[PDB]
């Protein structure tokens, strides 16, 4: 073994070309304001960390809302009962839940996602990433900063951040984040009140808009009065 | 490090989630912990001794009937009450409760003058002047003991919040839930109860 | 200071610094300097567990509770698997804390040492007496006190073994005295080299 240290000179498989900002110069005409650009309309700004906490809950709630949406669209199972499928016992069922899946997580027969297997992989993968994101563990990518919700190095392979206007993209993500978190809260409250999935509640509300509302179900007590 | 867990003692730290705000907030915290600690250990002891869950213990003592409390106490030589007479009554205890706790409260907080009038200052959670006859405040590392008490305070309050939410969900009791979980942890959990429903789903 | 027999020679690494040091280490287990604190702490732990065990055996025996060897089979609230899981978790946590404290780091110390030493001997005695006679410690003591002359270890099933061992103990220091006065005491080897 000798030291080569040649020039890689590799380019991204996709590298978004400069597209700039696709938003008006005004960036938060909506209620409230992005952090670091004005005063919080109602709730007090708890801490500098709260902005990054908002971003993380936002991205997680985006992913959760889209997961509940796609799971109910593809299987019809509500998200709040999808946990009962994969359990220490009979986690075989959870396998075939993806429409068009060429193959099952559980091949026919014994072959299957075990709860503990899935769980052990889940801890070892997600916790590792969670730690690497925060100050726990260490930084495997020194070029990026732990504790920054917008690293933008290897984590933007397409380079949309640099291709456009960075801060308008940031606020766009923030607005999507807040929208999805509020939608997630609506989904949990709907699950509590109606015991039916989000897309089921949507379908009931669009089939007969005038009925199948909060107040319609309240007339029946949300199945509790 | 004295406090290696997530948060830190008030004397030094930032209070990451909720801002520190007033120091009266820290006074309340300690008092809430000193109380909830007694509450959690009392619910523990009541469940172990009598099998009665804490959250319905008040049903036991009522204006018409407050005699059942006498036979509950385990290992007592004579009852609580005059046997059949059962002098202890809900109101009999209530007048005693309100007067004794009100005196203890007011002499704590200084609404009324301190009867002890021994240089003790009201509005301090740790007097250390008279409420430590054993001298463990005087001896040892007193600050380290404040830390331990705090830690026990916060743990006990979190356990209390768990106990009330388990009473609401499981409807069984804290120690009964503990025994169910220990007998079978895999198929007796919050998520197993959610799968079965909490009695409402 | 008094050693483990009148006329003994304490090993050079046993200079009385440690609590309970009677210059007894014929096999040179504590000869290595770096493992000697570990062996001290192993002594203290085995002594402490033997002390707790002696208390929990004698009180159990004298209060009419099930015999110490039978106490496992008694019907308890928690089955074997959950109990061993509890034990594994809590003792692992406590021993982790003890290890880290050890890594960080007179009269009463010596007292504890001697007490633990007696306990370990007494516990070994209880196990051996049960294994030979089948009698619990207080029953064994009552049997001995009933007929002290003929009811003893040296008249039990392992009696000749014990008599031979006591003969070896009684005749060891005399041979060590010959070894000192005739030999040079310049051994380059130790009974446990590590």
């Amino acid at each position: 073994r000798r030291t080569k240290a040649s020039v890689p000179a590799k380019r991204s498989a996709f590298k978004a070309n400069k597209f700039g900002s696709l938003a008006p110069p005004d960036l938060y005409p909506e209620f409230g304001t992005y952090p670091g650009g004005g005063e919080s309309p109602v709730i007090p700004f708890g801490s500098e960390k709260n902005a990054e906490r908002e971003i993380i809950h936002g991205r997680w709630a985006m992913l959760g809302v889209t997961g509940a949406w796609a799971a109910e669209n593809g299987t019809g199972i509500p998200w709040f009962t999808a946990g009962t499928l994969c359990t220490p016992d009979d986690c075989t069922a959870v396998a075939d839940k993806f429409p068009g899946a060429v193959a099952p997580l559980a091949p026919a027969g014994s072959g299957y996602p075990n709860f503990w297997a899935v769980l052990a992989i889940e801890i070892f993968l997600v916790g590792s990433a969670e730690c690497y994101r925060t100050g726990l563990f260490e930084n495997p990518f020194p070029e990026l900063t732990q504790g920054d919700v917008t690293p933008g190095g290897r984590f933007d392979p397409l380079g949309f951040a640099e291709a456009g206007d960075l801060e308008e993209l940031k606020i766009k993500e923030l607005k999507h984040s807040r929208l999805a978190m509020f939608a997630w809260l609506g989904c949990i409250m709907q699950a509590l009140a109606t015991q039916e999935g989000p897309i089921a509640n949507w379908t009931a509300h669009v089939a007969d808009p005038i009925h199948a509302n909060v107040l319609t179900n309240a007339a029946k007590g949300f199945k509790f009065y | 490090d004295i406090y290696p867990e997530f948060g830190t003692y008030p004397g030094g730290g930032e209070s990451p989630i909720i801002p520190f705000g007033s120091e009266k907030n820290a006074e309340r915290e300690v008092i809430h912990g000193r109380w909830a600690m007694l509450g959690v250990t009392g619910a523990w002891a009541a469940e172990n001794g009598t099998g009665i869950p804490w959250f319905t213990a008040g049903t036991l003592c009522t204006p018409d009937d407050c005699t059942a409390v006498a036979d509950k106490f385990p290992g007592a030589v004579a009852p609580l009450a005059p046997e059949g007479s059962g002098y202890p009554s809900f109101w009999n205890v209530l007048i005693i409760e309100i007067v004794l706790v009100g005196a203890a409260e007011a002499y704590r907080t200084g609404i009324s003058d301190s009867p002890f009038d021994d240089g003790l200052t009201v509005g301090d959670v740790n007097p250390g002047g008279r409420f430590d006859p054993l001298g463990l405040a005087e001896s040892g590392d007193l600050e380290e003991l404040k830390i331990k008490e705090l830690k026990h305070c916060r743990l006990s309050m979190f356990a209390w919040l768990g106990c009330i939410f388990q009473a609401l969900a499981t409807q069984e009791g804290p120690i009964a839930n503990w025994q169910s979980h220990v007998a079978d942890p895999v198929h007796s959990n919050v998520l197993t109860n959610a799968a079965k429903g909490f009695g409402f789903y | 200071r008094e050693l483990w027999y009148p006329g003994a020679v304490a090993p050079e690494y046993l200079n009385g610094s440690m609590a309970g040091d009677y210059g007894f280490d014929p096999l040179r287990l504590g000869a290595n300097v770096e493992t000697l604190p570990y062996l001290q702490e192993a002594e203290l732990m085995n002594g402490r567990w033997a002390m707790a065990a002696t208390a929990g055996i004698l009180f159990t025996d004298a209060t009419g509770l099930p015999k110490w060897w039978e106490a496992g089979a008694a019907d308890y609230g928690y089955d074997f698997q959950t109990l061993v899981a509890f034990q594994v978790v809590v003792m692992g946590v406590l021993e982790a804390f003890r290890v880290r404290g050890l890594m960080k780091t007179p009269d009463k110390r010596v007292k504890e040492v001697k007490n633990g030493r007696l306990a370990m001997v007494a516990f070994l005695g209880m196990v051996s007496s049960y294994a030979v006679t089948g009698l619990s410690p207080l029953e064994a003591l009552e049997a001995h006190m009933a007929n002290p002359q003929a009811v003893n270890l040296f008249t039990s099933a392992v009696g000749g073994e014990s008599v031979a061992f006591i003969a070896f103990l009684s005749c060891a220091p005399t041979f060590l005295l010959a070894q000192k006065t005739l030999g040079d005491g310049k051994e380059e080897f130790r009974p446990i080299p590590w």
């Binding site: - | - | 099933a157 392992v158 000749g160 031979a164 061992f165 070896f168 070894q179 380059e188 080897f189």
Partner: protein, 31 residues
């Protein structure tokens, strides 16, 4: 009649002492 267990273990302990003495002799020879 087989040998009693006490007989076997007494002879084995005597052997252990003999082995100790053999080690003493070997060490003395090695000097």
């Amino acid at each position: 009649m087989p040998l009693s267990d006490t007989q076997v273990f007494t002879a084995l302990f005597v052997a252990l002492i003999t082995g100790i003495l053999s080690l003493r002799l070997g060490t003395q020879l090695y000097k």
